[PDB]
């Protein structure tokens, strides 16, 4: 994928998005941003120019699937690649995440490998 390929890293906790953040720099992506909830996500997407989202589930004031169901109903935004990164893992939730939508799914705690895998999957189904 492009390298200059915009994204926006969104969980409730730093920790996490640093660790994407930083996980991504190794892959060449260095055109990042971070959102702590649905909401600054949804204005941060407004502003323009994201080509991808990266979302944990578990977050106030917007959760993630709400986030996602969002994005996918947006007309300007409904085809944005959503890949969730979450500790939620009944199958329930990723049963209901994919209806929703998701691009892909990733259980925490995940590995450098797993991410890489996952974001590099969703690259071939886009043909991006
Ligand atoms: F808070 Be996330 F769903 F891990
Ligand atoms: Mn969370």
Request: proline share 2%.
């Amino acid at each position: 994928a492009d390298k200059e390929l915009k994204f926006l890293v969104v969980d409730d906790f730093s920790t996490m998005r640093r660790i994407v953040r930083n996980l991504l720099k190794e892959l060449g992506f260095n055109n990042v941003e971070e959102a702590e909830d649905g909401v600054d996500a949804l204005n941060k997407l407004q502003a323009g120019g994201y080509g991808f989202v990266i979302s944990d589930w578990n977050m106030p004031n917007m959760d993630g699937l709400e986030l996602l169901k969002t994005i996918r109903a947006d007309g300007a935004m409904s085809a944005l690649p959503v890949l969730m990164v979450t500790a939620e893992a009944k199958k329930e939730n990723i049963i209901a995440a994919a209806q929703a939508g998701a691009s892909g799914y990733v259980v925490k705690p995940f590995t450098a490998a797993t991410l890489e895998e996952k974001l590099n999957k969703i690259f071939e189904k886009l043909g991006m």
